[PDB]
């Protein structure tokens, strides 16, 4: 059936899912740029672009 799965193999599938979660997030955050707020909604905060 295309709508069923073997219940005795959930742990194996879940374990592989967690490994995929970690691998997909192996990145470094990058500094892009900023600009000051021209509106009074914030007290002159610097906002990322």
């Amino acid at each position: 059936s295309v709508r069923g799965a073997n219940p005795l193999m959930f742990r194996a599938n879940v374990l592989h899912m967690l490994l995929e979660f970690v691998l997909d997030n192996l990145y470094l955050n990058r500094h892009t740029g900023f600009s000051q707020d021209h509106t009074p909604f914030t007290e002159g905060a610097n906002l990322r672009s």
Partner: protein, 49 residues
């Protein structure tokens, strides 16, 4: 003298227009203000360099 009026600088100068609303200018905001001061004096004294 003029930049200290619209920013947070320890330069000792008498503030006479503190009742006029303004914001705490950042480097980018102050740079545009400084550019305007530059051109104004250049036109008055007829400078091109």
């Amino acid at each position: 003298t003029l930049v200290a009026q619209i920013s947070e600088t320890q330069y000792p100068v008498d503030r006479y227009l503190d009742w006029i609303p303004s914001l705490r200018a950042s480097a980018a905001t102050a740079a545009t203000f400084a550019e305007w001061v530059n051109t104004s004096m250049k036109t008055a004294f007829d400078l091109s360099d």
